[PDB]
Amino acid sequence: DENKQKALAAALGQIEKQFGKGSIMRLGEDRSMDVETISTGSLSLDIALGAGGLPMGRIVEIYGPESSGKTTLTLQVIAAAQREGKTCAFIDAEHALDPIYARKLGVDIDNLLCSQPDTGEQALEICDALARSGAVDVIVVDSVAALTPKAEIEGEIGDSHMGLAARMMSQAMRKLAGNLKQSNTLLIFINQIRMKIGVMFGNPETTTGGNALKFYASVRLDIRRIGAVKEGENVVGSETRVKVVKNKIAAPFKQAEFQILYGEGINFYGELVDLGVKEKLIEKAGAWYSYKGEKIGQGKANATAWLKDNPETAKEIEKKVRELL
Amino acid sequence: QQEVFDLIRDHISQTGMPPTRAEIAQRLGFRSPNAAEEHLKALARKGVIEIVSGASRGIREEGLPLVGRVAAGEPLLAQQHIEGHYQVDPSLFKPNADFLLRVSGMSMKDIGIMDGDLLAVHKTQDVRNGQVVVARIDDEVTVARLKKQGNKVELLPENSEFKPIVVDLRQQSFTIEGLAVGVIRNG
Amino acid sequence: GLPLVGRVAAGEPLLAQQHIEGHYQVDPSLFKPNADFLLRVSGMSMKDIGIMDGDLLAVHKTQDVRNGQVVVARIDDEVTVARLKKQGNKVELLPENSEFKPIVVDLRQQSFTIEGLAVGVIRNGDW
DNA sequence: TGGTGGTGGTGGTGGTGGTGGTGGTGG
Numbered sequence A: 001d002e003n004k005q006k007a008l009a010a011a012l013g014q015i016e017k018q019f020g021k022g023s024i025m026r027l028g029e030d031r032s033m034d035v036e037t038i039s040t041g042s043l044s045l046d047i048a049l050g051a052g053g054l055p056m057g058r059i060v061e062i063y064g065p066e067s068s069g070k071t072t073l074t075l076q077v078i079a080a081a082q083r084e085g086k087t088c089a090f091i092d093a094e095h096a097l098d099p100i101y102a103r104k105l106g107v108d109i110d111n112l113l114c115s116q117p118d119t120g121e122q123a124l125e126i127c128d129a130l131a132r133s134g135a136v137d138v139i140v141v142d143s144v145a146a147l148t149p150k151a152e153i154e155g156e157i158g159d160s161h162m163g164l165a166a167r168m169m170s171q172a173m174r175k176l177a178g179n180l181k182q183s184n185t186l187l188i189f190i191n192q193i194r195m196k197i198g199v200m201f202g203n204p205e206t207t208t209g210g211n212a213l214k215f216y217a218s219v220r221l222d223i224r225r226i227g228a229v230k231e232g233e234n235v236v237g238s239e240t241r242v243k244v245v246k247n248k249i250a251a252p253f254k255q256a257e258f259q260i261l262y263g264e265g266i267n268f269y270g271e272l273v274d275l276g277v278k279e280k281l282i283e284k285a286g287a288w289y290s291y292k293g294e295k296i297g298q299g300k301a302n303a304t305a306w307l308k309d310n311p312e313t314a315k316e317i318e319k320k321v322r323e324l325l
Numbered sequence B: 001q002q003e004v005f006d007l008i009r010d011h012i013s014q015t016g017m018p019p020t021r022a023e024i025a026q027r028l029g030f031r032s033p034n035a036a037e038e039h040l041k042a043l044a045r046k047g048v049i050e051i052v053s054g055a056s057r058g059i060r061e062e063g064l065p066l067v068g069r070v071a072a073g074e075p076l077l078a079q080q081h082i083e084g085h086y087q088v089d090p091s092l093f094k095p096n097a098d099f100l101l102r103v104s105g106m107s108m109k110d111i112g113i114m115d116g117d118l119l120a121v122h123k124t125q126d127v128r129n130g131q132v133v134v135a136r137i138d139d140e141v142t143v144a145r146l147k148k149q150g151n152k153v154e155l156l157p158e159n160s161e162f163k164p165i166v167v168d169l170r171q172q173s174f175t176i177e178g179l180a181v182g183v184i185r186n187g
Numbered sequence C: 001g002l003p004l005v006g007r008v009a010a011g012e013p014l015l016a017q018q019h020i021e022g023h024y025q026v027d028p029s030l031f032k033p034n035a036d037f038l039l040r041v042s043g044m045s046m047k048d049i050g051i052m053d054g055d056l057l058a059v060h061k062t063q064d065v066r067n068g069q070v071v072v073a074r075i076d077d078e079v080t081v082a083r084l085k086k087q088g089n090k091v092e093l094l095p096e097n098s099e100f101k102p103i104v105v106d107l108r109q110q111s112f113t114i115e116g117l118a119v120g121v122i123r124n125g126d127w
Numbered sequence D: 001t002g003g004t005g006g007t008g009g010t011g012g013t014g015g016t017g018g019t020g021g022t023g024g025t026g027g
């Protein structure tokens, strides 16, 4: 009705007058609500995530067992953003980072910020301080199982500190959720695994640090090790599969695989040939790979080596594989 | 801690005033008043110390607390409500008792628990077949003897007029609430 | 705490020193008439009312008794727990079990003696 | 020309950590 139109217009004017310009608007007119993503370093994982990478202005969580490869994945993520001109920070609560290996995966070690906090509260305070600044595009927290509360630091071993870090984490998410989206920053939490005692039925594994992050995250990934990569009789790498156990920007529950080669990171060209086969752009003549009517090699290693040595075919295959999926 | 409480108990008598938090922390061997504050708060939460406006109001136990009900027959609603206490020693019972429950029904007559009695429970989650336990099955509690095998658990009666209750772990949730240790009757 | 009465020999009260098992601090006010002391029993004879072997039965000591009450008494100077039914000059102590039978011994030959009522039951035995 | 005299409390926050090996059989 005509009365309702003006009655609503006056209310919108009042709200915009009190809380500022833009406190309310049609959901189809807010461009700050659009989603933007950045690559994760492995093509299969970007296809799996649906949107094409990890969202900015959000929270992402990565958890898995030991020696699984969730620090290499995060350094791979950092490396790509710097190649695009984005500033980065890394917070090592675990006190276990090796500078040279970061330099060797691809990271520009002279521009990456680094902090080693003495208490979890200090780590989260630094996170918020950089989020408010508006000048840092990616923050990484090495582990949540290491964010010790101050009261636990000054005490003795054997003291009871029932449920204190969980309360701290809830407060932290509550305070960071808005600053992250306003400043358009991506905050990545790495987490460990522990066991639930006395469970009667179901999977007993869980994560540390409470329930709040399970709600406040937009994406959660599970990363695990499968097998060994043999250059000969000696091991030269690992086999990895990641799962999308949560997703708020695309359909959930997909998968992704790849290889981690010690000292180099993910081998992109190994992924490329696998994706090409699955997509009929590469021909597997039994034990022999083939391309466009010519013979390639006797295995995956030969195929990827040949592709690496031949940039033309690599570009041709990549710029087509990207289009379909 | 007990030693911290003793420090106040004798320091107050020797000097006439309680020691400062800094003094307690220094005696504890750490450079922070938080060390003394944590123990003072823990004692206060224990009901031994009173606090007002950040300072001790004084240095001024009711026994087992009756918490809720439990059903010998069909499962009964689980809802904690501490209605009262009873003055009885934990040391009486085999593993130390933690709280009391009120029993309704007659499905454990042979062993010796009946309507309206108080049952002492010892809190735990480690138990094995053949013991007397308390279980929660989708927000409802029962007391029975356990027999676990595979994906199904049998909760047996101890009276020939009642038949066993069986729950499948793939459909209903099952959490063990403790272990029974005795009975008190006053009716 | 309250004294506990274990095995009882003839010729002495229940609370005689050698009958004292120990002290267990149980508040006496929990029970309807104030509980005075406790007394271990072999309660196979009062199963149906919920008394078992090894449990403890609280007693408020008094010689006054009426019909229908559960009383600790002695016959032949021997302790027993049973309910009381009075005919007049004759009185019988009765069980609450499926296999036991009454006790109607003659007072002129052996007289009944009361020591207290039974107010409540406490137990700690194996399950 | 000269001042009197104090009312009444409000609301909870958060989960931890797995432990241990049995028993040979047949010409």
Ligand SMILES: Nc1ncnc2c1ncn2[C@@H]1O[C@H](COP(=O)(O)OP(=O)(O)OP(O)(O)=S)[C@@H](O)[C@H]1O
Pocket (backbone or CB within 6 Å): A065, A066, A067, A068, A069, A070, A071, A072, A073, A098, A101, A238, A260, A262, A263
């Ligand atoms: N400095 C290094 N040089 C060579 N290989 C390494 C080096 N650091 C780690 N790796 C290997 O990379 C694989 C995955 O290890 P990382 O990703 O670095 O650590 P993580 O698995 O994420 O967490 P933790 O600390 O092992 S529980 C493993 O096979 C490591 O052996």
Ligand SMILES: [Mg+2]
Pocket (backbone or CB within 6 Å): A070, A071
């Ligand atoms: Mg690591």
